[PDB]
Amino acid sequence: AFELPKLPYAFDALEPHFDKETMEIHHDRHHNTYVTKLNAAVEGTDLESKSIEEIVANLDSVPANIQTAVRNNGGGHLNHSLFWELLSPNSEEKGTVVEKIKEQWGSLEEFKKEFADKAAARFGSGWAWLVVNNGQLEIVTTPNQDNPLTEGKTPILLFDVWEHAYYLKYQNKRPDYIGAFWNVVNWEKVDELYNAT
Amino acid sequence: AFELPKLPYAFDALEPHFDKETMEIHHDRHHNTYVTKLNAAVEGTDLESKSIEEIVANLDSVPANIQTAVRNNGGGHLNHSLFWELLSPNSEEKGTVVEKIKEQWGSLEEFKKEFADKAAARFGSGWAWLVVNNGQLEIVTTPNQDNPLTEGKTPILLFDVWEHAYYLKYQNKRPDYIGAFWNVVNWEKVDELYNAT
Ligand SMILES: [Mn+2]
Ligand SMILES: [Mn+2]
């Protein structure tokens, strides 16, 4: 059922912020593995015909015998699918959400310091998120491949803090990785996800 | 109070199984970070003069203000301290526990298949363990820096499946990493920990 989406750019398009070796392994191996395991878990079930957003939104209703496989591999597919679309080689910091962030945090620089603090604080594997929670912007972090959509919050930006996302280039220096992320955020896609709510 | 232990061997001693670049970063950065944060949690407390094993065994009675910091960083300090001692450049597959494994599983290769399967199936960051429970051996995995000692089971072998442990050499290929581990297990130390029970 589910397919590995193509990247919207070359593996080396985000250099020198994200390394081309990481982009290839992250997409062609890790994300591909999530698609493979997700297809195995939903094969022959009533989940087969559902969009991955509908599955992750309604994860709490997935049968107990496949719920962990779908939480982990469905989460992995959705989160990596959003991540590729939310990166861009020629990121401009403007648009609807940048204006909303400035209004709420006072500056982009204040927003980035809170985002970096929470992203650096996530212990073990997970994600940092900008979400809309009942019309208000919030930063949250989740473990493993958990997604805030499961708790009725709409993600508009995410950031992978699994070690596979940064180890080849940055090793233990997750703060340097978070720093490099601001250079490649696709604020056009962030706006698109925000305006859809 | 707590100090970063000295490795018992050179950073390149476990080549070609575990790369020297990883051994240096793993010990000097990741383990060092857990010691720093553990010392900040416990400074001037009761816990400051206790062994890390008694702290981690009794986590359920550490007060809520520092419980998470001690779980994560206390865990990180104990788990990495045990890991360095349980690796050797002079691994020999014999002794008390190797014989017990052969008796219980039938052969070392069947034990290794079960361990490799459970270690491969730990989703996100964590550890695979050989524990003593109810007079027999059991393979268990835990998330992040959780340690079976906290649940009253004594570990005798552990294996780090945090991506920092293998990403520079193995990238996504966790099974090849698990394969390499058998070549550097300190079965002398495994016997020491087992016979102490
Ligand atoms: Mn990832
Ligand atoms: Mn480690």
Residue numbers in the entry:
A (entry chain B), B (entry chain A): 2 to 198
List passages from the publication reporting this PDB structure.
SODs detoxify superoxide, a reactive oxygen radical produced by aerobic metabolism and by the mammalian immune system in response to infection. We recently established that a Mn/Fe SOD from the bacterium Staphylococcus aureus exhibits equal activity with either manganese or iron. In addition to the camSOD (SodM), S. aureus also possesses a second, manganese-dependent SOD (SodA). All members of the Mn/Fe SOD family are related in sequence, exhibit identical protein folds, and coordinate their metal ion using identical ligands, making it unclear why some enzymes absolutely require manganese for catalysis (MnSOD), while others require iron (FeSOD), and still others show metal cofactor flexibility (camSOD).
Remarkably, the chemical differences between the sidechains of these residues are minor, with Gly (MnSOD) and Leu (camSOD) at position 159, and Leu (MnSOD) and Phe (camSOD) at position 160. The MnSOD double mutant (Gly159Leu-Leu160Phe) showed a substantial difference in metal utilization from that of the wild type or the single-mutant variants. The iron-dependent activity of the MnSOD double mutant was increased >20-fold relative to wild-type MnSOD, resulting in a highly cambialistic enzyme that displayed activity with manganese and with iron that differed only ~2-fold (CR = 0.486). It’s notable that, like in wild-type camSOD, this highly cambialistic variant exhibited diminished activity with manganese, illustrating that gaining cofactor flexibility requires a compromise with catalytic efficiency. The camSOD triple mutant (Ile19Phe-Leu159Gly-Phe160Leu) had increased activity with both metals relative to the double mutant (camSOD Leu159Gly-Phe160Leu). Strikingly, mutations at these positions produced profound effects on metal specificity, yet did so with essentially no changes to the protein backbone structure, at least within the resolution of the crystal structures. The double mutation in MnSOD resulted in an altered electronic structure and re-tuning of the manganese reduction potential to more closely match that of camSOD and more catalytically active with iron, whereas the camSOD mutations altered reduction potential to make it more similar to MnSOD and more catalytically active with manganese.
